[PDB]
Amino acid sequence: QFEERHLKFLQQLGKGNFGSVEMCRYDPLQDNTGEVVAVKKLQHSTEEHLRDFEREIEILKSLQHDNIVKYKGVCYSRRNLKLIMEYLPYGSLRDYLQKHKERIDHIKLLQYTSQICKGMEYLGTKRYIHRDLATRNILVENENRVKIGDFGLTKVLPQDKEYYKVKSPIFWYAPESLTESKFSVASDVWSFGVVLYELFTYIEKSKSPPAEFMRMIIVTHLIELLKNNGRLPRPDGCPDEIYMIMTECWNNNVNQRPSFRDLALRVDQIRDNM
Ligand SMILES: Cn1cc(-c2cn3nccc3c(-c3cnn(C4(CC#N)CN(CC(F)(F)F)C4)c3)n2)cn1
């Protein structure tokens, strides 16, 4: 339990469609000497958004893993519920890699890739489908650790099904998520391939998945493009096996995409060889 009176707004960290993350000092002693935390809150007073936010909070609370942002608790002002989590001083991987592209080499990129795989494999064991796997949702803990930092779109698989139908980051979506709104471990694997692309292009704005797909061309055009095996290009200086991994994640057939256990095995091998 966290007291609103002891939660001191420090700075804006990020913003989404219906939420925002802030850096706060949590100090019961009242002299700004306590612990710095990250706080997620909703933008406005809504019921459909609030119901989704409560489900998201219970999803995060249920997760305990080295590569998943740590849940700390909740803060009530009932409405207006706030999610308290650990603050990761280096911020998003999307921004971090854009800022330090000169200093980060392929071994480091493969270290981050492996950790994303491990975090994803753990989601799988819980039957959770992330649905929003992108570098913007990965946070940097330190130079040797990244964590999946947001679960706003995360769904729980039905007990008897390998997919969840929910009626959007379209440039990261698998074809069946675009055509049939079907989300699975396999569509999270497709999105992982897009993350691998993002990392090996060092977040070059002109080479981003929206930039590239729009040049190759909206949901209707993207469906046709993917059906005709239009794909993101090979990033400049890409190691051969990393491009083959991307290609395999992007198979139109759900059943021919690799597993997260196997991606972790393959990425660790490519990294060890270099
Ligand atoms: C120096 N520095 C540190 C940070 C920092 C630290 N932390 N520690 C926890 C979370 C963050 C974040 C952060 C930024 N964006 N995000 C999100 C995407 C994701 N992970 C979640 N948000 C979703 C919505 F709540 F806004 F809806 C966007 C999170 N930024 C920014 N600059």
Annotated domain spans of the chain: 1-87, 88-272
- Residues annotated as catalytic are 132
Nearest ligand 1 atom to alpha carbon 89: 3
Give every CB contact of residue 132 below 8 A, 6+ residues apart in sequence.
Answer: 150, 152, 153, 154, 169, 172, 191
Check whether 15 is labelled as a binding-site residue: yes
Instruction: Please report the DSSP string for 82-144 in residue order.
Output: EEEEE--TT-BHHHHHHHSTTT--HHHHHHHHHHHHHHHHHHHHTTEE-S--SGGGEEEEETT
**Quick check: 209 and 232 in contact, CB under 8 A?**
yes
Give every CB contact of residue 209 below 8 A, 6+ residues apart in sequence.
Answer: 171, 172, 194, 197, 198, 232
Give every CB contact of residue 84 below 8 A, 6+ residues apart in sequence.
Answer: 2, 7, 26, 37, 38, 39, 71, 72, 73, 74, 75
Annotated resolution, angstroms: 1.8
In whole angstroms, how far apart are CA 217 and each of 58, 204, 223, 228? 39, 20, 10, 12
Amino acid making up residue 158: P
Q: Which two tokens stand for residue 43?
A: 């933008």
The technique is X-ray
Give strand pairing partners of 14. Answer: 21
Residues 88-272: name the CATH superfamily. Transferase(Phosphotransferase) domain 1 (1.10.510.10)
In whole angstroms, how far apart are CA 187 and each of 89, 105, 118? 30, 28, 16
Nearest ligand 1 atom to alpha carbon 17: 27
Report whether residue 239 contacts ligand 1, using a CB cutoff of 6 Å: no
CA distance linking residue 197 with residue 200, whole number of Å: 5
With both helix axes pointing from N to C terminus, report the angle between 209-216 and 185-200 in degrees, rounded to the nearest 10.
100
CA distance linking residue 235 with residue 237, whole number of Å: 6
| Domain 1-87, CATH | 3.30.200.20
Give strand pairing partners of 163. Answer: 184
Q: What distance in angstroms lies between residue 89's CA and the mean position of ligand 1's atoms?
A: 10
CA distance linking residue 91 with residue 140, whole number of Å: 6
Report whether residue 13 contacts ligand 1, using a CB cutoff of 6 Å: yes
